[PDB]
């Protein structure tokens, strides 16, 4: 399924022998929707098991400015850099932008610092309203079709600013 | 299918195995173990074609069944077991000990070894790794892993590994005065003092070795083996003492008898 059957560098076509070998493989994609957690197991080469996630609803998400990861439930996937039918059909891929329940992070901030390691950082203002609404923006960072879970990190700073402009001189 | 090949054609066998063309169509493929197939010899060949104790493979098996032949003081019963460059095989029935070596020509020869030397094997370190807990471990040419080496032991050094305890006793460096033995080169089996080394950025490193008779021969860094310091070898070399003689004087001193 890989490496042949296509034009050369010059543009000529190559006569084919050596029919498809198993190690070329190429399994079908895992269009991971969000929903009740369900993951199948695929036996890759050498009996190495891979976890093909079909639906997830939660995952470990990190506060990178504070560098602390908390498990939380994802709400809705709102952007992905690739084809934008994936956001419409609500699939989870490696670096799509999703919405995350902010309550675990706010509660952790309260129990650690108080007031509504590398402490006393002064955070940023633009994330405060996003927290106060209750839902925050995050970027996936794992590969759900490979590791079987959808982990990610809260986006802030100019990256958040970039995605905010890209989502909503705007429509 | 296309799995691992499990046969060895007789003509495809390594040259130093030194088998005859007409003696059957196959050669004993060494079982995977502590040494490479090219850089070792199965003990079937070792005690059928070299020691001549057994004249058929079945007699090799009959010998091996009795736990009488020990490779590094532990009993081995695999027919196609790789014995490798230098190690002590002890036969208990005749109570004899052989340390395997090369010769100036470049074949594998057992060397008669006394008891005190038979517990004292040399291991050229190949890799220095560190695992969890900042514990360092050495991977040797013997396919052996030794944890808790001295920090001063370097990547290309050679340690004296005691056979019973499996512990290192002292290590030898690779300076420009260190006695070395060439293991796979055009000059395989030669012994010299390493005249110099030169480091090639991103390519093979070459070392030039000085012989006893001031004969300089170069080789790749990958196939040399420190066997002592400038003072003397830490093992007993075979009768040629690692001195490769030229094609002329070899004939000249073979003729006189």
């Amino acid at each position: 399924r890989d490496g042949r059957h296509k034009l050369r560098l010059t543009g000529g076509k190559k006569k084919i022998h050596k029919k498809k070998r198993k190690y070329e493989l190429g399994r079908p994609p895992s269009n991971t929707k969000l929903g009740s957690r369900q993951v199948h197991v695929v036996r890759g080469r050498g009996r190495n098991y891979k976890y093909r996630a079909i639906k997830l609803d939660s995952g470990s998400f990190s506060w990178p400015t504070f560098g602390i990861s908390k498990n939380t439930r994802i709400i809705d996937v709102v952007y992905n850099a690739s084809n934008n039918e994936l956001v419409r059909t609500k699939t989870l891929v490696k670096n799509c932008i999703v919405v995350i329940d902010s309550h675990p992070f706010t509660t952790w901030y309260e129990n650690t610092f108080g007031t509504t390691i590398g402490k006393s950082k002064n955070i940023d203002p633009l994330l405060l309203e996003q927290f106060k609404q209750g839902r925050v923006l995050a970027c996936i960072s794992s590969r759900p079709g490979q590791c079987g879970k959808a982990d990610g990190y809260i986006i802030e700073g100019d990256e958040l600013l970039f995605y905010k402009r890209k989502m909503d001189k705007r429509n | 299918g296309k799995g691992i090949k499990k046969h060895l054609k007789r003509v495809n066998a390594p040259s130093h195995w030194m088998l005859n063309k007409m003696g059957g169509q196959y050669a004993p493929k060494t079982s995977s173990g502590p040494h490479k197939l090219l850089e070792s010899i199965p003990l079937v060949i070792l005690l059928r074609n070299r020691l001549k104790y057994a004249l058929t493979f079945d007699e090799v098996k009959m010998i091996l069944i009795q736990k009488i032949v020990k490779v590094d003081n532990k009993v081995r019963t695999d027919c196609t077991f790789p014995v490798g460059l230098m190690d002590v095989i002890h036969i208990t029935k005749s109570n004899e000990y052989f340390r395997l070596l090369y010769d100036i020509k470049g074949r594998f020869v057992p060397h008669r070894i006394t008891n005190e030397e038979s517990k004292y094997k040399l291991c050229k370190v190949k890799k220095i790794l560190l695992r969890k807990g900042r514990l360092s471990i050495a991977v040797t040419h013997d396919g052996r892993s030794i944890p808790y080496i001295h920090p001063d032991v370097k990547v290309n050094d050679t340690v004296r590994l005691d056979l019973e305890t499996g512990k290192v006793l002292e290590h030898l460096k690779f300076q420009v005065g260190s006695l070395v033995m060439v293991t796979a080169g055009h000059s395989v089996g030669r012994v010299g003092v390493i005249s110099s080394i030169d480091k090639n950025m991103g390519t093979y490193d070459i070392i030039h070795v000085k012989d006893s008779r001031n004969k300089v021969f170069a080789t790749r860094l990958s196939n040399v083996f420190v066997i002592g310091d400038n003072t003397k070898p830490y093992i007993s070399l075979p009768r040629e003492k690692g001195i490769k003689l030229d094609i002329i004087e070899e004939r000249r001193n073979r003729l006189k008898a």
Binding site: L9, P64, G67, A81, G118, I155, G157, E159 | M201, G202
Partner: protein, 146 residues
């Protein structure tokens, strides 16, 4: 200014919060360009900035086309010995190479490239150093002993 794709270009490995721009020293005697040192671009395939590593062999060639984005075409000229006639014969082979935006590559300047992991269907080399070379005529036509 720098974000022109429909994705955030991050320069993975830069560190942004605690720390105490990311670059590496590529090795093999090549010097990391000051443009890569103090630049603002982000290139995942840059030898001095991205995730790629230079290993394999080093070649030199003449730039034939720089009209691909961050990728140039290098022509290597050489003489092939024809034994029967006991003389040589001109032959050439052009290889695609990835060119970091830290290099200002023009048409006809000799560049040296190092082999890397397959970056595309045909790219397996990345430029390491560029030396400007004035050209006359078509770079494809002209012949350099390199």
């Amino acid at each position: 200014d720098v974000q022109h794709e429909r994705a955030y270009q991050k320069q993975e490995g830069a560190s942004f919060f605690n720390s105490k721009r990311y670059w590496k020293k590529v090795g093999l005697g090549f010097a990391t360009p000051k443009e890569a040192k103090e630049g603002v671009y982000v290139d995942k395939k840059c030898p001095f900035t991205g995730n790629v590593s230079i290993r394999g062999r080093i070649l030199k060639g003449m730039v034939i086309s720089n009209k691909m984005k961050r990728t140039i075409i290098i022509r290597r000229n050489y003489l092939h010995y024809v034994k029967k006639y006991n003389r040589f014969e001109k032959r050439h082979k052009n290889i695609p190479c990835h060119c970091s935006p830290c290099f200002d590559v023009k048409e006809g300047d000799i560049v040296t490239v190092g082999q890397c992991r397959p970056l595309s269907k045909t790219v397996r080399f990345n430029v390491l150093h560029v030396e400007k070379h004035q050209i006359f005529g078509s770079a494809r036509k002209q012949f350099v002993l390199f």
